[model samples]
Target chain A: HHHHGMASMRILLSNDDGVHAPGIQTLAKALREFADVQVVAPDRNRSGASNSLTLESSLRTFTFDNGDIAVQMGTPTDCVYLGVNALMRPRPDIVVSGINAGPNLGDDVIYSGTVAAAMAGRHLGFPALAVSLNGYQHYDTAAAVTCALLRGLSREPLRTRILNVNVPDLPLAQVKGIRVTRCGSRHPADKVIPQEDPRGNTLYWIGPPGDKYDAGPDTDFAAVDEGYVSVTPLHVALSAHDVVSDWLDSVGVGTQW
Target chain B: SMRILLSNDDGVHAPGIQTLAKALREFADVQVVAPDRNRSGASNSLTLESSLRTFTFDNGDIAVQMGTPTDCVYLGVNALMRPRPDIVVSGINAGPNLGDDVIYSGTVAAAMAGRHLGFPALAVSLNGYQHYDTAAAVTCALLRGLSREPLRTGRILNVNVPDLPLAQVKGIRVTRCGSRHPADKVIPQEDPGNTLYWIGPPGDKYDAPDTDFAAVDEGYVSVTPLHVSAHDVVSDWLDSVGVGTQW
Candidate 1:
């Protein structure tokens, strides 16, 4: 593989699906066409592991035998934290998280270590991208789509924003065009599923996926259902800009106050 | 003399944090060491690569770490200030940090840092999207009570106030951590590069009457005392089933 100039493009790759997952491997291979890619990820699968960091202990890093990627004995966030701040040479131009094995749609982004990895990039003031395939199958459609998206990003680079992209399971040709959509609400689900063990002990698994909310003609869920890809720009600031006025007024303070 | 270490997830410049610092100045030796910029949804994290840096403001002390809220607390308690703080107070955040929001909040993560550092801590947030000074007033009242009673070690309190006028507030309700919004709202999007993604939205209320969300919904401030360890006792039942031991 040809190594592109560091200034031209450097992609830091990671995922929650473990170091050897096919999705990441495929992603690294595909993106190599347009950028210099390096992979740093968790040594094991760490699903539903929100934006957690390993604080009370020391984090260790391992370089795999192939020498192309490095593995961290930590969560997805930890991997990105290490990759961006420590491992990658000269830092990266952008952080690309996933071609995840499963879709991280709806509220799943909150608990997703995939998105957390991307956020770590944004936290470090670099543009980040979190990508997912919306089906349980192993088809490489999401990887192809992600590579194509990177091709565009290479042309027009973002300064300080993170993007979330969701690809449907359809063939690349059948996939409709892309849509820039807003985050929609999803109905609450049965998050706690109770079960009986062989010893008659009761156990519960954190619940199943909830129903889709606000599935209007323009939502992300609706777009995916209609065979189109969805991309939403997410900012690190969580301020509710709409309510700042009411807050300032309620506090008896004008912009001057 | 009481030494209070002040911090918030809303960054050093948020009005909520400024209000709390001003109000608490009367009763205690308050020192502010908050994030230089807003680090929302940062949860519990620390910056391993870079060393923390501090900037002194005209009103109070501000330490901006290239880290999470947890890292700020670690710096505040372990290195930043003098003589070590007696107690840690987080927030007066702009929005409510309830239910599963706790898992993603840098506000709560600050308090978690205090608890982890062996100090009593509290996290306070205002409910609803409306802006008013009543939540700030409520925080003042809570600070008064805390200074009087003083929390025991290893305990942190989470206080959520409804966004209302001071005159409209009903009262305070000491309660347990209630469940809300079991699921998250997801939004899907496609980039110009043809990649796909989904992002999380603001959480919805799932109050089961008399819960923290309901208390705030009824204009009553909700106070939940929490512990550091996240071990759920119910998961212990899996011991008999051999789930934890299973390879």
Candidate 2:
């Protein structure tokens, strides 16, 4: 059955890097080989926007050269929301969010609009995925890896099974295997840096992400760093962790609502 | 017993977080890093596209920032706050963050940021924006309870205190989030450059008995345990469809 007949599938694509970015363009073109792809994303970069929506401001959208949607003012989440609810016809069967430039690993998801783009789709009941290349170069390698992974889900209709994929920065042939990994606790431990502009107002920008402190075993960062493609299935629904879930039950904090 | 990081969406100059910072001083060392301006619906956003600047005021008791609530947490936990705080506290938000309100609240986002970065964090809000002491005292009790038996990581306690005298509060109740309907209207504004729409009149919904909404609606302090990975249903859903094994 073609391992999974994927050509007929309809995929809606978006990104935090905006539609003009090479990463989004690479992913949209690559996804077209396996599915009918349509691009709808922010007009400009909205990195670190997280799962925010532009409620306080006006949101405007227009069509780009290739029929891709451009949101003049909105976050990554707003792009997906407007695309599904307003722009796209017949509704999309699945959603794909990035093949972002930098590695979106570990705690980066907390601030990453790339992952937030995918999480937005998941929030609205679509099977969503976010992909990222280890570095800016070799986006096609990440695209090829993504094409392979989609084949596994070809038979599975899109649902809320969100997955985040990160590919290594190497030639397609040299790239290692795939591993399902968990999101880890490691981050850059970064600092916000202060800069004084010519105007002398003292501008500050968050420093570039820090070195991975403890991206230990079974983590997405570890897997990607070891030359493997890492796939992480995640969701953003809030609940107590297992460690505290039990503790809550012991404290008579159970279903007393 | 000491060392706390305080942040809010109402900006550092707002009386809510200022009162929180002052009340927390009785029990622990407090450092405040808040948005320089109000960022009510910022959610879990960060300012990655631009630079973030911090300005200290009141002899370093508070640091006002040109960023979002989540940015305050990100900047505070990573660099701004000194002595490396033990726990993070966000808010004394002017209004209640209940139901789907959590999805767009900068107050919850601040706590979420801290929790994501591996700290036990709390987001507290006052229902009617008055009775600041009630909210602060409730927060103090919760923080004390945490130090006694803290959850390791991945827990964000969302507290919603009713707008009443401290003596009138019935009790504290653990609850879950309820549904939130969208605003009844979307207000349009005239901008010279382009069209703009304001999310008119905040969303409201029925207060279910076992929800954060009802707890506060019924004159009780609401405590809801929130975690980052709210994806437990996916596994169950995937397994039912026969793809969990493949995944």
Candidate 3:
């Protein structure tokens, strides 16, 4: 029944970074050592795309020399959508997003195309993982951690469908271990910057992302800071189920205008 | 004592926004800066690589940029709206934003963006397209209540109203969000000798009990609190599976 177990596993690999990015390329090379790996990704960096879809236009696919598929003008979600629905034959066993260049921690998840790609995979009925390196240089460590997680998944199924993983930038040998943590938060981003274009027209650019505001011990920030891989389970629904009804009553919600 | 930054996924000219804008202006200094065109499903995407532009309408509402709802709110609070606004209120959307809809909704994304920027935010949607007036009335009433007591700021309130007359509205219900099944497969078509793909409609409601779906289906306005944080229970599982530092 079972041969080289992991060698039979299939993975649909993607990233918010373009198909040619170092992180995705490294992870793809790592996973292909054990599994049937298919790469479908955006043609260019689509960071901060969140869960957006390209609703206004049509998308075309280009096959690169390495056989990786590039989705032209596509969001991360769009690439995964096409990968799961149309492109990948017989569908892959799991979807893995990123090895992103930077960490998607705390509120960063809300705007991350990397995390959004994983969410799309989860929505399409597969185990999905979003992996990021806390720093830019340790993609090999992140890739190794991802392979370990996939190996673990093959042995034991996860009750959680999607995981947002952030690996420290340390080399694979210097890595501490994995830590299960909750997503922390950040302070509101800095003020938007304004400037004059070459033609002297006023222009506005989004400010830098905020500093950490809620980096507690059990947070993803703390784990990565302490050199451990942080695995935070992400939710599909955005409901505050615990808000008491009395609060609504106090606010006159049930009352007539 | 109220200044509201109003925007939506539907463009500024959408009837639902106009209705809500007129209604809100009755009580607050409402500034409308929404997308120049409908950016539904734009989610929280930002325009990082491009500079934004704006066009001022005769009504004084400005249509700014070709980006997501988050972009509109980000620019509005950070640059356009003078002196900044006290709250960000989005919608009276043409359709309901219940359950998993929040993930893909530019309407809700606008509110999320506002909350992220440290403003109290709300997103209102109607169950059907007809009675934006009903949704508007419901929104105005909630604003009245909120202006009085004020819920703890920083969390986004996603409100969905039944499309009925103000007199016909059964009160509001504070509910948790529900989810839907996975969307249908992408529908492919031929477009001028090219293959085109259209994202399919969302699946049927999966869990509706005590949920926003149930509340709106029963003709009540549903108000679900929302936050942008990680969800739960995976920590215990990770520990149990021995996937922790011991490895």
Candidate 4:
């Protein structure tokens, strides 16, 4: 066992899956091999959370029995904000999110709290990673793949970039090599099904995962579909640089007042 | 001809904003001032800490704001440009701005700016992924109608168009703002040092049919006319049930 001193390279580990999720525990165990691990996450599950900060309420922190992790009662974004701003001392070298239970590919990233956690880290200038297993059942393989990726990332210090990693839910041998890819499109499926609850009031349930729209070859989705682990670099800059000039021509100048 | 100030949550350079600006230009003299950067999900916020700056590009007559969408429209009317605009148009956003999303969209916030500043305003968004042009056309057509039948003072229209080709859109339906969202779950994880926390996963959607979400799901354009007021009239009913009575 490698017993690194407390002041060694600190890793900030978090997830949107809440404190008790197995995926996070496995990730913490796997990462412990390389760096001193700090576990901080939401006190409860905060899924579908985007980059929202909790300004309305005071953030509450809890210490678990192991005393290695801290839980914050807030969003994924809040966890990172408070984690970096309040809890961790000496700061973390990298902020790692997930080994999430499900994939956060394509537009799904917009609503993903896992990716949001990583984005918060990136926003704070930390190299961050958001990882997910493509399938729900094969999370063990996902965890192992995440370990491999973290091992690789631990070697090179990449600053100012956050990575979104997706692993296929296949056995170790069936898993293809890791592929760095771009964000792809998914067939939009945001249908809501309305049902009446026991109180005779109507409640709605969002539909299941939809089909993929533009999952062309070499995309993160396609890479994982082909059994390859996919790592995508994400940034906050959403400008479509290629189209900006042409757009300016079409709109004309000085018209807005 | 009435002049319209156009902006969006997707920043000044988004394809949706460009398309809307072009189509609106066909009717009235259109001017555009939007954020220099995309501020997608930035809700009704004003840049209080920082002084807003304006960047004028050479190609288009548009000026980009280094501020929120609210600040964009506010600066467009109050500081940056010329004669006060007649109407403010925000969006033709790439995604649907329905249900609780309005609470977090800079698009809607821009329209709210217009209403707050005593101008007729409208916020428009597309209901589908990867569809921008259709919503732009819808926004243009609606702007024409809105000019003819100007919105009441202090009110703004929140319009959501289905992601159909201009030819495929069903007629627009005026509706009320719907309230629905999925229950959220917060997932927690630990860092290697066990000092920080991360939260992820989103709440599941729980919306009913006939709501804006339902209308979008059925490919119908949903237009919800809203006001700056956030008063809950239901408080009166709750008072009758003794819920609001303080002990």
Name the top TM-score candidate.
3
Say which candidate scores most in DockQ.
3
Write down the TM-score of model 4's second chain. Answer: 0.80
Q: Candidates' DockQ values?
A: 0.04, 0.35, 0.48, 0.03
lDDT of 4: 0.64
* Model 1 interface DockQ: 0.04
Residue A233 alpha-carbon offset, candidate 4, angstroms: 0.9
lDDT per residue for candidate 1 within B1-247, as digits (tens), equals: 7778888887888788888887778878888988877777667544432345566777667657444576567666656668778778888888888765576678887775422344557788988646536766766665565556544434466779888877777776655565554222223344553322223343456544546677787777776655531112212322332221222
Residue-wise C-alpha lDDT for candidate 4, range A148-214, written one tens digit per residue = 4444444443433567889887776677666567788765443334466577644333344457877
Q: In model 4, what is the error at residue A236, expressed in angstroms?
A: 3.3
- Chain B alone, candidate 2, TM-score of 0.85
What lDDT tens digits, residue by residue, belong to model 4 across residues B40-139? 7555544432344456677445555545676667566755558778788898777777876575577886764532345657888877656677777666
Compare candidates 3 and 4 on DockQ and give the better one: 3
lDDT per residue, candidate 3, B124-199, as tens digits? Answer: 9888899888888878877887778766545688898887887887787788888888665788888666677777
- DockQ-better candidate, 2 vs 3: 3
Best by lDDT: 3
lDDT of each: 0.64, 0.75, 0.80, 0.64
